[PDB]
């Protein structure tokens, strides 16, 4: 029971529980990514730390959603967390591509949740997504695309490697 | 006269004046609540201070609205402030229930103002309500509902009182 | 492939992956427990914070195991995380009993892993469990049993409540 | 003569003297490795410093064993230190492979000493190996395997070199 619920549709409440599941799944994905790069036969600890920090941010996003669910008087319902889609993640390039795919899917889920909140005339929900999720996700995707470009440049060629060093080491 | 007014409908201007009245009324309600709990025959100074702080927050909300009215080039119009609905407020439980009723009514007025601003295509108004009012009101209502649950638990029973002390004193 | 693996049996490697799954499951359980106590109709924030901290400790335990798996040259394999066994957790007493059941099961898994490491003559594994898991788990279970006794005393009776206050407030 | 010896078998006492010899031999190996990389025609001072620090750690391990031998009432007996197996150590890759071979052999000697202490029911010995040697050796081997992977990646190819720079310079 709740004595506080106001203007909070069952549709949104359900969608928020699904979004918590997606965020926790993504956190689990990034946990797997990070420990893959910590393998002795891979050994790119910087890549390990990049994904470890993303695992933490996606868990924090889920916790924010759960806190909001309780603030509106909705009820958290948890489902199974499906294991990540791969057990080994290939090259740095492969892993950064998988990460962008994952983030695009979370972004689309955020946009879908906004469409539902708009249809339900739920401005608190909209505000919440704007305050904590929409711009954070755009920033992250921009950083990943920048990373993808630089991995491609570096693994591709000696001119590529040259331009990278000029920017990174001289500038 | 105004030389600055742009995209600011007479409907919104009127609705904002009504919302100032509601906020000032709520401030007056909380003033009455607080001094009731300061009576020698009631003497719950912590409850007095809780309502005294709410009186201050509701006055501040009204002042924010008035400042916004002037920033958009609308004209503040004041009406009578109706005295609060009771002269004595009963138990702590009774008073917390009345407070949640009051906050729900302010929240609904905020949602109604958003619906009007949306119909008038007034995004500055929407932004304003998001920046200062929607999440503040949800947070406050959540706190009041938490309080209601704890008052009910405490006044209800020895098991209730027991669980409360474990949480509050041990944890 | 690994160039470092030495004295690390496939049986232990598999058992460690299963133990990571159990720890992550327990973390997920505690996440559900904590947000249950944050509901407006439950509203025991101290209990919420107790379980929130346990969720963090169980995730940290899983991460320690994963780091150890990589240090020995074993390969992390993740499975589905089954959702927690309940959606609502009843009283504080009910929830503390469920927590002790959960911790007893992790403790038994640690003891089973020691039995396997002993049979495989793997002293590094034994050392690892001693350094990070066995005494931590005994300490936690002792704290939970202490909590269970105090909840029982407090919810049970006016003599019980009296003895608790003497200890907590006077001493 | 000793007035303190208790539960300290002649077998363990002998094995500990042999382990001191192995540790001092390894220290001597690393001394040779380090000065090889300081040659003007090799000139990788970072590699020199890596091996110089390992020479120091292996000497410290021997000194710890000798101190323990005296604490149990056993008698240190020293043998010849055989010169290192090579006079020149080839590439960085060659030298890191030789180092991992050396560390694997010390690790196996530690495991063999644990097997003997277990057969002799000598828990102080076991504790000692756990406190100062088993996890230190696993950590070191993990670091060396990580190094081997990164040397292989770097000396192998332009894609390899690219991935390394992304991790090391960008992340
Ligand atoms: Au990682
Ligand atoms: Au890392
Ligand atoms: Au929206
Ligand atoms: Au909306
Ligand atoms: Au650079
Ligand atoms: Au540079
Ligand atoms: Au550089
Ligand atoms: Au007052
Ligand atoms: Au007061
Ligand atoms: Au609006
Ligand atoms: Au609007
Ligand atoms: Au208390
Ligand atoms: Au207390
Ligand atoms: Au207290
Ligand atoms: Au919580
Ligand atoms: Au909490
Ligand atoms: Au063991
Ligand atoms: Au063992
Ligand atoms: Au107390
Ligand atoms: Au007290
Ligand atoms: Au007290
Ligand atoms: Au050197
Ligand atoms: Au050096
Ligand atoms: Au042993
Ligand atoms: Au032993
Ligand atoms: Au670098
Ligand atoms: Au760099
Ligand atoms: Au660099
Ligand atoms: Cl990680
Ligand atoms: Cl809306
Ligand atoms: Cl007052
Ligand atoms: Cl609008
Ligand atoms: Cl929590
Ligand atoms: Cl063993
Ligand atoms: Cl040296
Ligand atoms: Cl023993």
From Swiss-Prot, chains A, B, C, D:
Positions in coiled-coil regions: none
Keyword Cytoplasm: yes
Keywords per UniProt: Acetylation, Cytoplasm, Cytoplasmic vesicle, Iron, Iron storage, Lysosome, Metal-binding
Region (Catalytic site for iron oxidation): 53-60
Chief location bin: cytoplasm
Recorded GO CC terms: autolysosome; autophagosome; cytoplasm; cytoplasmic vesicle; ferritin complex
PROSITE patterns (UniProt xref): FERRITIN_1 (PS00540), FERRITIN_2 (PS00204), FERRITIN_LIKE (PS50905)
Modified residues (N-acetylserine): 1
One example GO MF annotation: iron ion binding
Localization of this protein: Cytoplasmic vesicle, Autophagosome; Cytoplasm; Autolysosome
Residues that hold Fe cation according to the record: 53, 56-57, 60, 63
Entry annotated with the keyword Acetylation: yes
Gene Ontology terms describing biological process: intracellular iron ion homeostasis; iron ion transport
Family: Belongs to the ferritin family.
Extra information: In horse spleen the light chain is the major chain.
Function: Stores iron in a soluble, non-toxic, readily available form. Important for iron homeostasis. Iron is taken up in the ferrous form and deposited as ferric hydroxides after oxidation. Also plays a role in delivery of iron to cells. Mediates iron uptake in capsule cells of the developing kidney. Delivery to lysosomes by the cargo receptor NCOA4 for autophagic degradation and release or iron.
Assembly information from the UniProt record: Oligomer of 24 subunits. There are two types of subunits: L (light) chain and H (heavy) chain. The major chain can be light or heavy, depending on the species and tissue type. The functional molecule forms a roughly spherical shell with a diameter of 12 nm and contains a central cavity into which the insoluble mineral iron core is deposited. Interacts with NCOA4.
Protein name from the UniProt record: Ferritin light chain
């Amino acid at each position: 029971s709740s004595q506080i619920r106001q203007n909070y549709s069952t549709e949104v409440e359900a969608a928020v529980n699904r979004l918590v599941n997606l965020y926790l799944r993504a956190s689990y994905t990034y946990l797997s990514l990070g420990f893959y790069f910590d393998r002795d036969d891979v050994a790119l600890e910087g890549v390990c730390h990049f994904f470890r920090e993303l695992a933490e941010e996606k868990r924090e996003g889920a916790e924010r959603l759960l806190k909001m669910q309780n603030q509106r008087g909705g009820r958290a319902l948890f489902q199974d967390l499906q294991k990540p889609s791969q057990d080994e993640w290939g090259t740095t390039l492969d892993a950064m591509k998988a990460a962008i795919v994952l983030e695009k899917s979370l972004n689309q889920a955020l946009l879908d949740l906004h469409a539902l909140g708009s249809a339900q005339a739920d401005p608190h929900l909209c505000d919440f997504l704007e305050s904590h999720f929409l711009d954070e996700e755009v920033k992250l995707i921009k950083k990943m695309g920048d990373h993808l470009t630089n991995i491609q440049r570096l693994v591709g060629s000696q001119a590529g490697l040259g331009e990278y060093l000029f920017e990174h080491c001289t500038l």
